[PDB]
Amino acid sequence: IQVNWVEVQFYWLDLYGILGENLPLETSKFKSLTSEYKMILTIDSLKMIKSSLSTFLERQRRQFPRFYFLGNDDLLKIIGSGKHHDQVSKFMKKMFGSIESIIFFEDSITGVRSVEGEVLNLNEKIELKDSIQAQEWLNILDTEIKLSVFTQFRDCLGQLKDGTDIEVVVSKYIFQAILLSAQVMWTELVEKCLQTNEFSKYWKEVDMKIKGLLDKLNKSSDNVKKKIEALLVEYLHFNNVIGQLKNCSTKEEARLLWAKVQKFYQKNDTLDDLNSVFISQSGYLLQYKFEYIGIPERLIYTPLLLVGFATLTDSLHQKYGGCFFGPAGTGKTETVKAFGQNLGRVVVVFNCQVLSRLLVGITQIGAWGCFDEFNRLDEKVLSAVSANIQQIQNGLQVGKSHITLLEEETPLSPHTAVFITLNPGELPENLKKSFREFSMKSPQSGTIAEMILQIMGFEDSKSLASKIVHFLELLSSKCSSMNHYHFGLRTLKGVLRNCSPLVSEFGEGEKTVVESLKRVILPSLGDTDELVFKDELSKIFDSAGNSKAIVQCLKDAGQRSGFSMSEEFLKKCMQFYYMQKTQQALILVGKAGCGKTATWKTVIDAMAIFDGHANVVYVIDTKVLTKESLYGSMLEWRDGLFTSILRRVNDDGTFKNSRIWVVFDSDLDPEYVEAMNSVLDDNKILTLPNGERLPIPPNFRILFETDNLDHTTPATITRCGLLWFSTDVCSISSKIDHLLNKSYEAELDKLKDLISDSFDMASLTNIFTCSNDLVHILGVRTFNKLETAVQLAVHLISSYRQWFQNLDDKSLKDVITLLIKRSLLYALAGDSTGESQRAFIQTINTYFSDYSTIVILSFSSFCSEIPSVSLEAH
Amino acid sequence: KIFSMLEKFGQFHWFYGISIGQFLSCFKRVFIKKAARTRVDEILWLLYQEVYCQFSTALDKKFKMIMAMTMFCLYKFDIESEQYKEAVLTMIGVLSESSDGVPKLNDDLRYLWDYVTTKSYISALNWFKNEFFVDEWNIADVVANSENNYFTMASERDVDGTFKLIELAKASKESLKIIPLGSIENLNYAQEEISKSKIEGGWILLQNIQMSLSWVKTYLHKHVEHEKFKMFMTCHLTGDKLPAPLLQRTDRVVYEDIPGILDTVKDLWGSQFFSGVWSVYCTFLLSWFHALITARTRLVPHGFSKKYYFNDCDFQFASVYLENVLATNSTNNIPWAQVRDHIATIVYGGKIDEEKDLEVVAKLCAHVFCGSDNLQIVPGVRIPQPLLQQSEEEERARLTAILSNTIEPADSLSSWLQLPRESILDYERLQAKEVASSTEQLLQE
């Protein structure tokens, strides 16, 4: 009963950390059972007590509502560390959404780190003690971070009202405060210009401002780079708004354009911190929550984005919930998140019991909770969730302060708003009675591409953006629409993101755009699609298209490995190498025997020879190991093999300097890639069931090798790089030559010379073409049959090598011809009926017996060795 | 033959099913209700009239017309001669754009020829109802001549029968209890209300059970002689499928919408009460715009691209936006361009996806919300701009007068909607072609 004793000990120590070190019937039953266990199954009684003690757990969970989002096990693990002050700041990103870790100096809270690691200077320190509970100092930290955000907002407003330049303030305060300060300064200057009829002076001022910010962006390294481009997106938005107002003919048109765009305001009469800044869109008023959200990317301020923002403002003015529906890829959830990050609130994204819990948490904290793919729910859970959201909404319009959900008294926040997006391919009646549906159109990708290229500083922006969007539209129109063909906004943003690593060696201009567009789009197409892509790239782009070392190492590795350097093989190898140079997540697509394992092994060996880096290969198949064997289940805890190799590469000196490569050489099941959804993106963190966050080295490159993509989501196609094998990368004689080299490695010179001389391509091509017209049971290609033909021939020669030194050359040639004929008969057409075997004999004889063989040696027959068996009746 | 045709009607749609016992009770109603030189022809004609007068109300307008004219066709197949059949089939073929021919010359056929050569399909097709059938039953006649107490008045979208139900409740001297459905507290409230009213009496209305089909399946099937107790289960024709045993045990009633546009404006203005003069003027203009866009909504193949549903939430949103625009303006100068863009884009053009309907709505807003001195929203009425030296009450009186002054002509759908008449003629021709094709499909089998 070792496992039972371990479980009882774990239960005892966990409940000690919960209640024994802290201070009726349930506690008395626990103390009696603990005394009985110490004197001496009680584990089931302890589980029943924990089920009965969930009401106290729920009360403690509802004491501070930030902790409500986490599960029961994570919450009790957090609560159990009530004196050690450990693990609280490690896995707290689930309750805040944008804060990863907390730094503490001299047992006092003084800083907060964002989702990427942005260090923030808190205004007031927080005392820490073992008697202080987690909820109290968590609330203190929340109040402190809100106060710090507000006082940095005040400092930014003071320094901008003092007339100081912005290049000295962009590098020391938080991005939210300078965001609000820039927006307030812009709306004040444009309103003071709206009291008159001039716009040129502040337009030139903001033009010089965006020039200075572009120069600082070119001089910034990483964090300042992200901050400056995030500010520079809305600085181009301000320039666009002022330029649009410049061309207005009358006062009424200028007033329309100014009321349509977002306007920012603050109140100089009130004294409260969290409710002193309000934004106004098309007349209505929304209050700024003053919450830290880290430094996420800013959506490019499309006019349709402002239309959608006006739609959410109209929906939230009367406490209605905004609703979106339209084709996938138009950016609906990104629009909702942009509204949240612009107005200053984190939005808890739902990937739609647990849904009801997240719903009541988001309606009891007052933050916003959005939805995605609302139509994929099962009917019962859809009805329950719809009833829950409609009843909390009906509580919201009615002005109720508390609502009863799941037989608990949950207070209703006066700031809760819930949004739902749809992907039709609909909204129920109860929800449509209380929502405001809006239809997102196709977003203007030209404006997005132009502004993104203006961040990247390319010398041609508008013409380049128009050219690339027209080129993507023409590829969408003029290609075979298969499952994995995406030519919309996601691939455009991927190409514009992948243009960054090539600009330092290729220079800013059109050629970097052409090179990255090739390296992204070209390796995911077929053959006629490749021809159409090449023709369109030559026609629409001026650039029509120093790699001696990598190609030479590739040729050397392929020649020493026995492979042949076919031109399609060389092209596919170069595309794979240039595509793994930047993108980490790659898949391999192609039929059986297309040359995928060979091409990645060739490029890995060439890379090891060229760069000098060590390579460790972990081949694995997805479908031969179950879910628990690959990841790990809670019985105690057992580690899966993938988690085992991550554990031995993270916890481990050789692995740091070595590139560990893992390949998943099987079909892409949706479950395993859904479990891989947390590492294929930019997060790069395994989500273990127990909550362990195993790190991943940047050299850990994931690969997939799958023939069929009918059972894979299009999101994985967009997120991970796709390599396509439309044609075989080998000639047939390459297959025979590599197979012969491998078999020789597994009068010998005369024997191999005669073996090589027995294979002539001019007649082999004709006999293969003739044999391809035969009927094969469980039919496979001849390209897949030479694999056993060559091995059978070499094994027969190696078996008969013992008596190959006392016969003439003509007899040896006859033996060679007979054995090659036997191998070709038994492998190429050795899977058909005997009548078709006789037809094969006639065809191969007219192009150059049925049971002819060699019997120990002479050209004997099988008819002289059959035994007439003697059988008895029983 | 009639029950076979009604069986095809039942297999067409989930709400158009008919029971055998309903047919037998309707046939007994023929003898309950108390000549062609005999008695059996009188019994047959009274059978046809009674089955029309009873089972017309369980269909919408198009199925009412096809069933009426199919019953007329069977009766005239039985009674009249071969040349009569040839003429009737010729008109059915020319109404379906299948066979073109001339009648083989009964002045009723002459009026039918004069109707169809004038391209008046609606009158030539209501000729059957106006000639053959002399009795028609409304909802009051159904509720006054039904021993069953459970009613399923399922009305299609944009058509609301609750007002007529409560008006009939006053007419029957009874207070209805409107019950919303969807929330569990309202589920328990509805259960308590029906438990009280099933023993104490009193009418009760159940509405919007579309999200509560789960509760309906779990409760009403197990749930199914008290005076003045008649519960109504208001459903929707375009909604999800009601349970079949519940439909077999309940009467089926379909409601029809008001054909006018002026009455919609009058109802919206009566439902609106309050706030300056310009706010009242904007509310009046917005009510006219909402009635115009709701009228143009129903013309599906020509007026718009597809069916839409502009309920009262959009009217409330637009009214609140107009109130906020007029209130937050200290210059008392209404920015008509901004409110035009916001009405055509966000409020009413929100759920509209394709660009042509958005352009249609923007054109309608430009025609209505222009805010000129001479505002001719329709050719019938002229609206002058309000003055400054008055109050709200005399403006309310003037606007009530200018609603009472105008009248709705018969060509309102072509004149008040700014739509060409040839599109209306093609829409009516397509409707006549569809109903003639379906009735010839029913007649050939």
Place this chain on the structure above:
Amino acid sequence: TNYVLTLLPKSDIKNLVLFCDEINLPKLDKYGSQNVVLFLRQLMEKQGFWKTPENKWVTIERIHIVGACNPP
């Protein structure tokens, strides 16, 4: 067989042959793929397999695979 990480047949002279009758008879999973034939493919192509409870690599040396299945 016996374990020595190499998998060794009990017969020190004779090659062990793994019979597999009715290869078509195992059923595909919920996402259009089989599992035991993929295990056999890994055994005959990668010349080994990965152990599930210990997460260790075990190679094969002289065990062959035969089949006997009807046409589909």
